[PDB]
């Protein structure tokens, strides 16, 4: 690999200003560590990095201080384990012009080998292979990448009882490394925007809540079979495929049709429905009124209760009138459906759907009119039998989504998870119940604070489509990793387990950074 | 001019560190030739080319092996003369970022004159005008342009038809030219050039098919009125505006209404329809289902057959059970229409339309159902009564388009072309034609391996919106040029022509690389 | 051994007159790796390769540019060890014309030992054994072989499952290696290697389709009983024994007899047949018409449907007039049979057979005519009653073959494979299945771009009848090898397996070049 690049790092002028500083470059300090197991395949990539000053601790804080950089940086690797262990690793410096993934053939680029038995550390100096121009802390332009790959797999002769060893990574800047465009310290560009700050501990401990139910988040729920979600959900492209803005507020739809069933004008069950694409007061999407639940309706016939329906309180409002008609005000079961008045069927897709309401108990005096509005409150309560507390609501089938929505499915051994929260439940009027309030797990895709920050800031040039942004969770007994995708869905490396993970013994959350999607999030509980 | 700069290029070049290949390249190799006539006016530009590793053919093969390039290229010019013809051309090396087109004069540039009376070739070195920045082979950036323009008019002493001579160009890399970043010439796909591979000899010869009727390409059809195409179309930005898959696939639509009109349940024409924009089971877009024809319907009255209709074979398919109805199996006209079920009228706008199907002959027993599905085969036949019929189908007026689709209209003397194929026609019981095939012409806007390849790999930033990518088609006798826009339309230089070009006597196809879109593409057949 | 011959090669080499490329090739590049276990017996041959410009990847790219080659190649071997395992391998440079296979011993050859306890790589030069005759790049002739065989058995001190280690090979061209006859690296097609291009990553990924049902390839199916295929099949000799075109094309047969059996002219099953070997309007061979299925008929009785029948949609077409009959339009079973019109029995021999068609449902009015034509579409559907049905179709017993067609039967542990795809099934009015696709498996013997490419360019004398051309298929987790015989069958190394291999998690495909056919192809998935 090149070495004349240093003369080119060498060129200065008006970026230097006064009084440049070598800073500390002398010794090697801990950047990172990686694990190598007998499990891992030849041609698998254990460690990768683009050349940057964010590869020492000292040059990452100086990055705020300086606006531009140039030159080489040295990477030192220490294999720890034993001299009795077979296997070999390959470290190679790759020039820019590349897309890294399944076709990027590490063992056919100029490279050096690292042997597992090495007692002493092995060093590489990584130069600049495009040294002609200063990089800012904006776009650097395309830079060389350092990749370490397994050439032949780790062997223990004493069997499978011990099966992994670690390799340390240490760095120091080289001689040719320099900085420029100092200015004075402040915050700047792409550096200040990262998905990291969305998730944090106080939100999961007790400050945060879900985006479907406004509940307190008690758990993490794995969903092996996948799911799809859009309403009040957001991505790292800054937009939503939903019809709700990211806050809880009343459901107002001005044009629907209203009727009642029982052939009696007083003491009857109220019905309201409308087709999708008439939400004239909603800017987000005219498909349904903001605040309307993303679930398919649940059939009930009087006096029988809906088994795990969404219920909210409200009543019927005509457009000419300043406030709703009181006689109509009652609890309603709400959902998305097709086939109103009396051929009702649930719908999982918004295209050709109908937004439907029916009162769970009798209204004082009904109303027959068309068109006329529906006015129902911000968050809902769960309708379900008396002492019911089985699994969670909605199940993946129950969630309604648009045809623009991308679905959440497993990637590798990484499984999508939903955030589980405590919801109010009711067993139908009076009687008895399993407890004082009863147990009930309502689930959402996201914590509402993450949803507000995806809507607030655009993170497209801040997490790549192949990556997850990763944080690690610490529990009193055990720890795990959790990931957020660019499509807004959250993942865990739990595989096919369904067990509820308890956030109530949560000590901590902290970022691990960007990781590629296929590679498994840690689960040790 | 800039021939001192040999030593100042030699600071920008050397950080890379690589060998010089001199011994192979003693001789110059053929690049192109152009024609010079008595009617080519002074100020006109006959020939232009950008600096690129693709100018010498052997350097193009070597470009594959390397990820960067730099240094100059020599150009050598031969005038074919006579010695009795007067006139001159001017050769200038144009700076980077100076727009090329007919507005461009050589007037105030450094230049050499190329003389009509010359008998000796005249050799210019084209130096590197970017040398501080090494160029990538697969993302190069901005380069200079070599331009040749007519200073003085070609004049002949005598009469006759004889009015033209040719000027040949051959090239050789200079002693400053260099390849660097060998790495692994291992597993990159588009090292080979992405745009250039779209058209090839055996593909235009007999391997290729067209992307709308699946026929064999016999010819090229100019459309001097211009035209528009959205479906099964891709482009050099990777984007599309269609609904149908990149390959040909069968029609399955689960959600329609079926009915018939008449005085009886039997020996009637079956009708089925569903709305446009409702196909939520199509991954590409909801405009219609996959396999659905992008040409407007043909109204007809029982018992008569539609002409220049798209007909396909299929039947009514039960949505609840998932299974066909045999009695319904018949040939059907499938099309886009508006005014369903019974006020039907034709449109070319998808929005607010209905995708409609009607049988071309009597079904034994019809069915009235809602909902019911439609299941029809992939392949399509043109409906035409006995012998002599319509010139080519679809005509540009028949084609439907969806918002976002740009239309292709002539530029200068370049006119947009469609690809013509021989297609199967059926129409009217025991009909016949004047020929055995019954010579019926189906047209597509692209060849299908091109539609598939432009959907499989990226092509962005390779061709400039002012330029066309050019290939030269070579016949046993004569040649012509064909061009590709950024948009993914093909163009040819026949001007106000409607005449069909016969591709039967094709020997070869070669890439000519980008050329300005106002440059006429030559026609000598 | 033969390392004196440096100066005697230098008379045979020099008449050509060319430069030496040294500066690019400082380092060695990855060629392959193989596995060494406690169960690989002494005398066994683990790895073999012929001298060829295709061993180093960058030399392969350069081979394109040149029409001849000569000189040696260095080979470098790394044992992955541990230091507690005993055993040895022997490395010999084998003379030209000495047959390779398991009968081959290293016993009396010059050799080096490669040691289990080795920690340092061991490097052999493979000299040119042909130097008086310069080799062609695109017709090379006879070369020597490098062979590695087990001298002493791998032994472990301890128990556990741990029983294997790997040995890597990397190569570098020698200082004697040379390229000559640059000419024009211009316009030769198969400069690139003809055999190697047949299988590619995006082709096995999602661009390829199979050559009998036109479906998407999901898997590989081993057939440990062996099988035979003639139609739409080509080979590495360019020869075929089929009737149908290299692409999928519609059935048109002008000369048949049509009849029905029953008690009435209406609501009957139409039957049509013509003899095999009579299709004089088919350019390829008169065995049947173009588009006709190469699987034996399925007898059925009215009113029941055939199972695992080939069904296609079409009708009776008037031979005198050249035009269809609408009333006859229906779904038909098309097949090869013997015993027509009414003693019909199935066969797999074409000679003395009849190509037969029978409708699967009632036609409104039937026709009795002689002669009358048959006109049916290209695409085909599998006939199956409701849900659970046959494992794959065609089964090897159903396939018809014509004289001259060789059958593919296992060799050693390599077994012949068919390519599996998901195909459309229809059968029995308003039927259904357990899944929405109704998971029906269609099989082809080759991928269709391979059938088309093996018909488009020549391939003779590239692969030796004892060897198989090998490609390596690489997955996200594990890898396997696939092989191609001279005959144009594909093979895999699953032995007595019938289990279907799922190609869903494929990352990559790379050519491994020829290997002896008795060599097992590896399976680690």
Numbering used by the authors:
A (entry chain B), B (entry chain C), C (entry chain C): 45 to 569
From the article:
The etiological agent of RHD is rabbit hemorrhagic disease virus (RHDV), which has a single-stranded, positive-sense, polyadenylated RNA genome of ∼7.5 kb. Mature RHDV virions are spherical, non-enveloped particles with a T = 3, icosahedral capsid whose outer diameter varies between 32 and 44 nm and whose structure is defined by characteristic, cup-shaped depressions.
A model of the NTA domain of VP60 was built based on the near atomic resolution cryoEM map of the RHDV inner shell. A complete pseudo-atomic model of the RHDV capsid was then built by docking all the domain structures into the cryoEM map followed by MDFF refinement. Furthermore, comparison of the MDFF-refined model with the initial rigid-body-fit model, showed that the local cross correlation coefficient between the atomic model and the cryoEM map improved from 0.473 to 0.634. MDFF not only improved the fitting in the loop region around the 3-fold axis, but also closed the gaps between B and C subunits at the interface. First, the NTA domain in the previous model extends to interact with the S domain in an adjacent subunit, whereas the current model shows instead that the NTA domain folds back onto its cognate S domain. Second, except for the β-barrel core motif, the loop regions in the P2 sub-domains differ completely between the two models.
